[PDB]
Design a protein around this nucleic acid. Structure first.
Ligand SMILES: Cc1cccc(C)c1N(CC(=O)Nc1ccc(-c2ncon2)cc1)C(=O)C1CCS(=O)(=O)CC1
Ligand SMILES: [Zn+2]
Lengths: 128, 348, 617
DNA sequence: TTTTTT
């Protein structure tokens, strides 16, 4: 408590997730996710093009809803973008980073042991 | 019988010219430049008033006899080392010391040699002569010969002893502050006043002493000659800006050594009190691993946060060197840290 | 101005402890005699070596890279008698830079130079003889004998060379302490007993005893006044215990498999050994700095405190470091993150990435150019070595297969893009490869500089007219950050160097003065040979995580190999940059399986939980 | 996987 009150006075206020999302007309997260899903799939085409077309028609379903984290799945079993083991589930994760800016991270949870069994692993994080 | 310690420099190599004034040889001798000087005679206000009397505002000193121990930057850890001691008692010799300690006029070799106290001057080099004799085998004469016949060894050996005594004017304006206050007062204290007067300041570094000088805010008067601190080029201009400085021949020159002691005493009263509180709790908390890092990084914020530190340093800043007329006031570092964190961590 | 305050007033207790640690007289019998070091020379194998004690003190000044442990070495130097040393030449120059920025510091060399390390010791069998410690509890004598048997091929040579001053000055004064002056070129260990070793975590445990041992040597042959005063060495070891490691390399001469295992550094040896923590009394002799002047971001600050002290990894930390992850093909692509240093966890990976970067910078039109580098092997030396390896059948190219990582004097050599060596027998079987270098890239000498020359246009002025046609110029007649400019040209291998014009690469310092450097010649000597002439410059654009420990970086992109994830490597890689804003990574080290070794972390934590340990912010 | 000492 004394650490938090003293950090708020020396470094600055880090606005909560809800307030930051409110700037981009979100009171609706699953709809904002759809608008940036294009940016997400474009970075997938640029860096992971061998699995890019699985991400042409995707529906965003909320997974985790917190005041600092919002994970949202994309069911259309998609493919692992890290290794070449139908093994992974994709999750878009929105957090507030840097100068109170929205960081959108594509994360994938695979099942094969090379990828920690059913553990979240990020792949790319872009701004919104 | 007033005893002076003088840090000298030359526009040329110093160890060369110096050894060449310890043999009475008219071959190599260059103007000596005294920019730093401490004068002393064998309470705190008794010490201030005694010094303000010697460092006369008029200029130079007040005693009638002077024993100047000319010193170079070396290690006897001493920061300076005595080279030649010189006794000026004759009217003309006292007159030339006064216009070299008060205006910064180079003290010509002939006056350095005329007042040379050979009895005590060569006593400093007596062991050096013996060791050089023993080494090369495998008084003034002792050196005249060792240098004329074995110059390189003597120079290099008087260069190993008296280490880095040959630094340039930029070096001084860099390590002894860009300000005139630093250039005079800090050079006097850190070199010729720290170890002699003892005290805690003997164990403090140059940056610490410069910080203490920065908080020694004795009223500054716009330099009469408007001489730029950056303009100083040779040891001639550094010495001039220093000897005729308002911080060299009076109240400020008398208050700085006492203010060093006062500031350290006030600071440690607070730093030590709070380190005891941090040490009692570090040892008797039995707290969580992350919470321990949280506590220690919170403890040291409450004790040394930039705002608290700024208030404390503004509470020790002086506006006058007279200890009985000082404007420094009690610091709120310790009282507040204890009344805002330590009683609540004593809720164990 | 208030930044120094805490250090200024907290280093004083440190200074008021090192003094009594250095002014403590030993009993007459405990002083190692000269006859001890005479017998050591007589001993051939390190087995009949006697269990004797060589007394020493320590004062550990530990802390993160950004802690102020180096400002403490400033106050120590100007107040105390001391011989300041460094574990690496870069660290020694860094301390010189930071000690001459306040006052005078004599040329700071490495501890290796101080105890007499020379050229032939570089490639010496330093791990050969065994030792079954008659221990548990391990006596200090047994630990010192282990560290001397470890370094037998170095301790024995140093002792023999020293064996096979001050007494003259003592005869006259019956002056001595003026021997450091009148009698010059004398070892610097003869004039002080406080030895400051900075970044001492880069030294293995074998060195600690060694240094103490060597100290007594150099104070026994010369009969120093400190030896007459019965003083003992005090090793002020300054370094980061959780951001630095020491590695031992052994080369098997038949399998040609150079292996590098992890070792116990001096800091870990002192912190984690119950025998040393008692004899040296580390509780009353610790100085843990707790500051990171190279971290103002609260969040990055929390993460760096979590990794230095070993605190549980929570979900919030995972989400924070999630904002740095950028794809594998984004870091490795040279078109992205221009000017960002890229760290890999393999030398092959760096050799791949540098070649890819050169391909990018050539196809898209800096300028890449192969520069002549040669390896001068000797026919007789290799034939004799093939005879002695129990395998006289071995090809020269197979000799240069894995002995390349060893023939070099700098590790960065294994991570460069070069052409293939040659079977160019001269009869010396010389060889020739060709490294590619990007002109105007960061270039870091791993040489003798000869300066030739020096409101936005460059005032190009040099002592002689230069014409940079292509890259070679036409001049007719380590810490310093240089800039690659161009290759102006202007005993058995000396003759060939006269034959083939040796190119001298030209570098531009921070000021802008064009300084032309020389070439490096390095030997390989290990057995159970060859001198390499090359340039010895590093790009500073890509490197290994292990080498990154040494020097801090501006912008960092980390390429992490899954499975080999060690959280210490992650902490080292992420802590090289001041600001978390300029940091990109392959994956999340906190979200992937990582082998954490939190053993020294709890030891610091228990040190932070001891009333006699001085915690200076 | 893994640098460094002249
Ligand atoms: C301690 C302090 C005192 C005064 C002013 C400030 C700014 C601070 N700092 C800076 C700080 O701790 N930096 C740091 C970061 C990482 C590491 C490290 N450890 C291992 O490797 N690196 C070390 C030091 C804080 O963070 C406060 C802020 C308010 S508070 O929350 O009340 C207490 C902590
Ligand atoms: Zn997977």
């Amino acid at each position: 408590r004394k650490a938090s009150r003293n950090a708020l006075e020396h470094f600055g206020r880090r606005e909560t997730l809800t307030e930051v999302l409110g700037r981009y007309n979100v009171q609706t997260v699953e709809g904002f996710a759809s608008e940036l899903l294009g940016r997400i799939v474009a970075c997938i085409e640029t860096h992971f093009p061998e699995h890019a077309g699985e991400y042409q028609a995707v529906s965003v379903r909320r997974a985790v809803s917190k005041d600092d984290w919002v994970l949202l799945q994309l069911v259309p079993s998609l493919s692992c973008l890290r290794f070449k083991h139908a093994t992974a589930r994709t999750f878009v994760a929105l957090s507030v980073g840097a100068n109170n800016r929205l960081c959108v991270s594509l994360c994938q949870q695979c099942f094969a042991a090379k990828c920690d069994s059913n553990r979240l692993h990020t792949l790319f994080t872009i701004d919104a | 019988p007033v005893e002076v310690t003088a840090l000298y420099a030359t526009d040329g190599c110093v160890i060369t010219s110096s050894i060449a004034l310890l043999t009475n040889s008219l071959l190599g001798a260059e103007p000596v430049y005294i920019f730093s000087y401490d004068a002393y005679t064998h309470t705190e206000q008794d010490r201030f008033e005694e010094s303000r009397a010697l460092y006369q505002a008029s200029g130079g000193l007040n005693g009638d006899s002077f024993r100047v121990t000319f010193c170079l930057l070396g290690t006897e850890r001493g920061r300076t080392r005595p080279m030649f001691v010189c006794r000026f008692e004759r009217a003309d010799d006292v007159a030339a010391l006064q216009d070299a300690l008060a205006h910064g006029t180079p003290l010509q070799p002939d006056h350095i040699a005329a007042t040379l106290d050979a009895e005590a001057t060569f006593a400093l080099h007596a062991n050096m002569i013996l060791a050089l004799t023993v080494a090369i085998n495998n008084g003034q004469r002792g050196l005249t010969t060792l240098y004329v016949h074995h110059e390189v060894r003597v120079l290099a050996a008087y260069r190993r002893a008296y280490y880095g005594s040959a630094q340039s004017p930029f070096w001084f304006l860099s390590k002894f502050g860009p300000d005139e206050k630093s250039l005079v007062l800090t050079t006097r204290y850190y070199l010729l006043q720290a170890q002699r007067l003892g005290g805690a300041g003997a164990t403090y570094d140059l940056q610490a002493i410069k910080d203490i000088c920065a908080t020694y805010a004795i009223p500054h008067a716009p330099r009469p000659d408007t001489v730029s601190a950056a303009s100083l080029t040779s040891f001639a201009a550094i010495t001039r800006f220093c000897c005729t400085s308002q911080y060299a021949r009076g109240a400020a020159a008398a208050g700085f050594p006492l203010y060093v002691e006062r500031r350290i005493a006030a600071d440690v009263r607070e730093t030590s009190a709070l380190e005891k509180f941090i040490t009692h709790d570090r040892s008797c908390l039995r707290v969580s691993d992350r919470e321990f890092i949280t506590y220690i990084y919170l403890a040291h914020f409450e004790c040394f946060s930039p705002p608290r530190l700024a208030t404390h340093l503004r509470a020790v800043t002086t506006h006058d060197p007279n200890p009985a007329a000082s404007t420094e006031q009690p610091s709120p570092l310790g009282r507040e840290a204890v009344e805002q964190f330590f009683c609540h961590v004593r809720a164990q | 101005a208030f930044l120094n305050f805490t250090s200024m007033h907290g280093v004083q207790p440190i200074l008021k402890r090192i003094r009594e640690l250095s002014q403590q007289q030993l009993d007459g019998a405990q002083v190692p005699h000269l006859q001890w070091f005479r017998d050591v020379a007589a001993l051939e194998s390190p087995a009949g070596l006697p269990l004797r004690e060589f007394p020493f003190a320590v004062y550990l000044i530990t802390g993160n890279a950004g802690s102020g442990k180096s400002t403490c070495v400033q106050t120590i130097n100007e107040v105390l008698d001391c011989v300041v040393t460094g574990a690496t030449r870069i660290a020694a120059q860094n301390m010189y830079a930071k000690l001459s920025g306040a006052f005078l510091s004599r040329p700071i060399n490495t501890i290796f130079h101080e105890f007499g390390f020379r050229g032939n010791h570089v490639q010496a069998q330093l791990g050969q003889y065994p030792y079954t410690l008659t221990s548990n509890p391990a006596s200090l004598e047994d630990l010192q004998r282990r560290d001397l048997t470890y370094y037998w091929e170095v301790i024995l040579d140093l002792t023999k060379r020293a064996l096979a001053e001050f007494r003259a000055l003592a005869a006259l004064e019956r002056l001595t302490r003026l021997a450091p002056a009148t009698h010059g070129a004398l070892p610097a260990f003869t004039r002080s007993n406080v030895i400051v070793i900075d970044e001492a975590g880069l030294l293995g445990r074998h060195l600690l005893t060694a240094v103490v041992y060597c100290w007594w040597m150099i104070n026994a042959l010369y009969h120093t006044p400190q030896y007459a005063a019965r003083l003992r060495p005090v090793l002020v070891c300054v370094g980061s215990p959780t951001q630095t490691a020491s590695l031992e390399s052994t080369f098997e001469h038949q399998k040609l498999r150079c292996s590098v295992r992890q070792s116990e550094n001096v800091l870990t040896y002192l912190i984690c050994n119950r025998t040393l923590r008692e004899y040296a009394r580390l509780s009353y002799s610790w100085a843990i700095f707790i500051n990171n002047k190279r971290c103002v971001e609260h969040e990055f600050g929390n993460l760096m405190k979590v990794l230095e002290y070993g605190l549980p990894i929570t979900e919030e930390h995972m989400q924070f470091v999630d904002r740095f992850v950028v794809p594998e093909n984004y870091i490795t692509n040279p078109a992205n993150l221009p000017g960002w240093t890229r760290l890999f966890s393999s030398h092959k990976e760096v050799s791949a990435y540098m070649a890819k970067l050169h391909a990018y910078l050539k196809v898209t039109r800096f300028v890449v150019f192969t520069l002549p580098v040669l390896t001068f092997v000797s026919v007789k030396e290799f034939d004799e070595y093939r005879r002695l390896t129990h395998q006289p059948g071995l090809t020269i190219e197979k000799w240069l297969t894995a002995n390349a990582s060893r023939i070099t004097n700098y590790s960065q050599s294994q991570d460069q893009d070069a052409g293939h060596m040659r079977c160019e027998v001269h009869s010396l079987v010389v060889a020739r490869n060709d490294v590619t270098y990007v002109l105007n890239s960061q270039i870091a000498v791993t040489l003798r500089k000869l300066v030739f020359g020096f409101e936005v246009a460059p005032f190009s002025t040099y002592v002689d007219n230069v014409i940079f046609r292509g890259c070679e110029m036409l001049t007719g007649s380590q810490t310093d950050n240089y800039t690659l400019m161009g290759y102006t040209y202007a005993a058995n291998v000396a003759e060939l160097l006269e034959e083939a014009p040796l190119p001298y690469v030209v570098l531009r310092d921070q000021h802008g003065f064009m300084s032309v450097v020389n070439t490096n010649i390095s030997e390989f000597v290990e057995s159970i040979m060859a001198i390499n002439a090359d340039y010895g410059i590093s790009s500073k654009l890509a490197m290994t995580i292990t080498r990154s420990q040494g020097l801090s970086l501006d912008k960092v992109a980390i390429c992490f190999t899954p499975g080999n994830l060690r959280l210490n490597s992650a902490y080292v890689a992420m802590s090289r940059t001041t600001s978390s804003e300029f940091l990109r990574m392959n994956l999340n080290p906190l979200r992937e399986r990582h082998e954490r070794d939190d053993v020294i972390s709890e030891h610091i934590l228990s040190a932070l939980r001891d009333p006699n340990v001085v915690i200076v912010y």
